[PDB]
Design a protein around this ligand. Structure first.
Ligand SMILES: NC(=O)c1ccc[n+]([C@@H]2O[C@H](COP(=O)([O-])OP(=O)(O)OC[C@H]3O[C@@H](n4cnc5c(N)ncnc54)[C@H](OP(=O)(O)O)[C@@H]3O)[C@@H](O)[C@H]2O)c1
Ligand SMILES: O=C(O)Cn1c(=O)n(Cc2ccc(Br)cc2F)c(=O)c2ccc(Cl)cc21
Length: 315
């Protein structure tokens, strides 16, 4: 297909519209044009602060007529603030409320990373770091096995999230459910060859976030790296009379992956979905993998002393 095989027998589309960065002012149009175009998969979250407006679009595309609930794939996540098994529960409730649906297709633990509950989405040190939470990897996994049992969510998994932390959850006693998917970032400057064959190896599904390198990331500086604007990628894209975003987007798909591109911009929603027409050669595939600088983009660093920090091993 256009559509990978979940452990829960279900069928996830290869391509979806990301929704991180997308103001409440741009996100209903973005989603309704993605639907008229053809994306049936979307990636939301409660942090994005836009879910409610993602929803109404879905809602009027449904009730207008273009799509059926069945044929959707909505994905969302658990904030760091309700790793509390007692609180996992409400977290899926007001998101499903937000969304205006009665179920969700795949639910994520947003981070390996527990922080202390209150209003603030990121409670800070008094000096540098996040105020963590005593909460627990596999004991939070359970609070959402519970969510499947109760009907709320058809399937379940992890965001980003290393070999260690994965390999814990399937060694958990009493293990009722398997993670479906491991949402990680990937792109040409981290290819992550080796948790290619752990994640997936042995045997869960990978969704590549930030496929374009994310150049509207709040910590937006560098001076330097620039996947959209890179000389040697530009030429791949020229060869296929396609664009670089296209080449970028095709790239995870072709490694057995799932891609969530974001844009709010109707032009490039409709454009970003235009990627089934070409196959990258064996050489672009070799090359765009030779580009691996090990270079993280989501990265956050007032959380770095926290025990469950994804990015402290190599895979
Ligand atoms: N679990 C996680 O921690 C996590 C973290 C990061 C990302 N994700 C998810 O994955 C999705 C994708 O990542 P992203 O938001 O990080 O970054 P991204 O999709 O790689 O990059 C977003 C930016 O690329 C620009 N763009 C997109 N298509 C383009 C095109 N054809 N030509 C030129 N520019 C284009 C967009 O412009 P405009 O949008 O300004 O038009 C936008 O600001 C997110 O929306 C999010 O839901 C998950
Ligand atoms: O979480 C997301 O999907 C997107 N996203 C993100 O990626 N990080 C980085 C980050 C946060 C916490 C930890 Br722990 C590690 C990290 F590196 C953010 O700070 C972030 C901030 C606000 C919102 Cl609305 C989304 C964000």
């Amino acid at each position: 297909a256009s559509r990978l095989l979940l452990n829960n027998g279900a069928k996830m589309p290869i391509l979806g519209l990301g929704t991180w960065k997308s103001p409440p002012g741009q996100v209903t149009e973005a989603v309704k044009v993605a639907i008229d175009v053809g994306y049936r998969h979307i990636d939301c979250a409660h942090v994005y602060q836009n879910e409610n407006e993602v929803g109404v679009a879905i809602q009027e595309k449904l009730r207008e007529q273009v799509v059926k609930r069945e044929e959707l794939f909505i994905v969302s996540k658990l904030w760091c603030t309700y790793h509390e098994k007692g609180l996992v529960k409400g977290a899926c409730q007001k998101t499903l409320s937000d969304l205006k649906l009665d179920y969700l297709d795949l639910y994520l633990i947003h981070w390996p990373t527990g922080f202390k509950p209150g209003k603030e989405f990121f409670p800070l040190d008094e000096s540098g770091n996040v105020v963590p939470s005593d909460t627990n990897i596999l004991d939070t996994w359970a609070a959402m096995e519970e969510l499947v049992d109760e009907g709320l969510v058809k399937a379940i998994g992890i965001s980003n999230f290393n070999h260690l932390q994965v390999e814990m959850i399937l060694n958990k006693p009493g293990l009722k459910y398997k993670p479906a998917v491991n949402q990680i970032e990937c792109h040409p400057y981290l290819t992550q060859e080796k948790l290619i064959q752990y994640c997936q190896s042995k045997g869960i599904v990978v969704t590549a976030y930030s496929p374009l390198g994310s150049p509207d990331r709040p910590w937006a500086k560098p001076e330097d790296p620039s996947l959209l604007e890179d000389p040697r990628i530009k030429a791949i894209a020229a060869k296929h009379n396609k664009t670089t975003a296209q080449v970028l987007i095709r790239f995870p798909m072709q490694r057995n992956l799932v891609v969530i591109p974001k844009s709010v911009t109707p032009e490039r929603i409709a454009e970003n979905f235009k990627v089934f027409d070409f196959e990258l050669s064996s050489q672009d595939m070799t090359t765009l993998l030779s580009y691996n600088r090990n270079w993280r983009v989501c990265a956050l660093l007032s959380c770095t002393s926290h025990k469950d920090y994804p990015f402290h091993e190599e895979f």
